[PDB]
């Protein structure tokens, strides 16, 4: 239901997202190679991919991940890790909103997600910008899983419009703000958000719509099961803000479904 090229980008940024959970990838020497224990990121390894920047327990919400260089694919990749204990994080997640007129007028964002990005935003922008002037033909890509896919999206909405486009690939990301924010994220130019969800993963169902949260459109929804290899016929593109039909269905959600986006994700030590 999506093109093969789109499947391959989807597949490739899942593995970048996965690679941010391995502890070696959070405090590594720049110019060094991005690798994963457990075969979590073979596509990244197949490209000549090295650390530009490396960060662990940064600022306000322990922002962890890496800035990568990909010469084979010609990419500048900002990858944010999700929580080191997802189950604990799902259960303690607050639904508190805050206004973010900085980004867009009338818009509100999750206080936790918003603040955490704000914490590390200046530095990380410097680091991306330096890569851009240095590799001006390279494409900027922000990505992440779980709480990292939220950070990617928010950082993507924040940094766009500065001379370079920014695509965002998020895997099992929670909702990130109210309706005006979701609307804003749907139409914003200067890059494309590819919001990826798996079957009945809980995380994209929080915070609840009852607390004033909405999801941007479109939605790329993976219909193949947990531990089941994904093909391109298993990803259906679901349009419309707050649409039903993909992840947002009235049925009982699941945790293991969150940890299977093309292969294992969030379990790299």
Backbone phi, psi, residue 187, to 5° = -105, -10
Q: Phi, psi (5° rounding) for residue 17?
A: -65, -45
Rg (CA), the chain: 17
The residue whose two tokens read 């994904």 is 230
- Strand spans (E) along 106-255: 108-110, 139-145, 166-171, 193-198, 219-222, 235-238
Q: Do 62 and 54 form a contact (C-beta atoms < 8 A)?
A: no
Structure-determination approach:
X-ray
Residues in the chain: 269
- Strands 75-80 and 139-145, by their bridges, are parallel
Cis (ω within 30 of 0) for the bond into 218? Answer: yes
Could you tell me which of 265, 267, 232 has the C-alpha nearest to residue 13?
Answer: 265
Which residue(s) pair with 73 in the sheet?
none
How does strand 108-110 pair with strand 139-145?
unpaired
Please, is 251 exposed, middle or buried when counting C-beta atoms within 10 Å of its C-beta (0-12, 13-18, 19+)? exposed
Nearest Cα neighbor of 155 from 126, 118, 205 is 118
Report helix, strand or coil for 260. strand
Cβ atoms of residues 65 and 37 within 8 Å: no
Distance in angstroms (rounded) separating the CA atoms of residues 232 and 226: 16
Alpha carbon distance 248, 240 (integer Å): 12
Strand-pairing partners, residue 219, are: 238
- CA-nearest of 81, 77, 85 to 116 is 81
Segments of 49-183 assigned E as strands:
49-58, 63-70, 75-80, 97-99, 108-110, 139-145, 166-171
3-state secondary structure of 55: strand
What residues are paired with 168 via a beta bridge? 142, 193
Cβ count near 48 (within 10 Å): 12
Q: How far apart are CA 208 and CA 222, in angstroms?
A: 21
Q: Is the dihedral of CA 148, 151, 157, 161 positive or negative?
A: negative
**Torsion angle (degrees, nearest 10) of CA 170, 173, 179, 184:** -20
Measure the CA–CA gap between 94 and 179, rounded to whole angstroms.
Answer: 18
The candidate with the shortest Cα–Cα distance to 196, out of 3, 13, 5, is 13
Q: What would the two tokens of residue 189 be?
A: 């130019």
- Closest Cα partner for 204 from 219, 186, 185, 224? 219
Superfamily name and number for 1-269: Alpha/Beta hydrolase fold, catalytic domain (3.40.50.1820)
Contact 171, 14 (CB under 8 A): yes
CA dist 94 and 265 (Å) reads 23
The residues carrying an active-site annotation are: 146, 201, 258
Tokens standing for 24?
């070696």
């Amino acid at each position: 239901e999506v093109s093969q090229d789109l499947f391959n980008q989807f597949n490739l940024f899942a593995q970048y997202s996965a690679a941010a959970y391995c502890g070696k990838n959070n405090d590594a020497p720049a110019g060094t190679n991005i690798t994963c224990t457990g075969n979590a990121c073979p596509e990244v390894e197949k490209a000549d991919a090295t650390f530009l920047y490396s960060f662990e327990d940064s600022g306000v919400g322990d922002v962890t991940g890496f800035l990568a260089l990909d010469n084979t694919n010609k990419l500048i990749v900002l990858s944010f890790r999700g929580s080191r204990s997802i189950e604990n994080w799902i259960g303690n997640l607050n639904f508190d909103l805050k206004e973010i007129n900085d980004i867009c007028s009338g818009c509100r964002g999750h206080d936790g997600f918003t603040s955490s990005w704000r914490s590390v935003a200046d530095t990380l922008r410097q680091k991306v910008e330096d890569a851009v002037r240095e590799h001006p033909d390279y494409r900027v890509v922000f990505t992440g899983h779980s709480l990292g896919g939220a950070l990617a999206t928010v950082a993507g909405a924040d940094l766009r419009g500065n001379g370079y486009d920014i695509d965002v690939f998020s895997y099992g990301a929670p909702r990130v703000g109210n309706r005006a924010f979701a609307e804003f994220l749907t139409v914003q130019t200067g890059g494309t958000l590819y919001r990826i969800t798996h079957t009945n993963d809980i995380v994209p169902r929080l915070p609840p719509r009852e607390f004033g949260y909405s999801h941007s459109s479109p939605e790329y929804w993976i219909k193949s099961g947990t531990l089941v290899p994904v093909t391109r016929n298993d990803i259906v593109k679901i349009e419309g803000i707050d649409a039903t039909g993909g992840n947002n269905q009235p049925n009982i959600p699941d945790i293991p479904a969150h940890l299977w986006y093309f292969g294992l994700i969030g379990t790299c030590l």
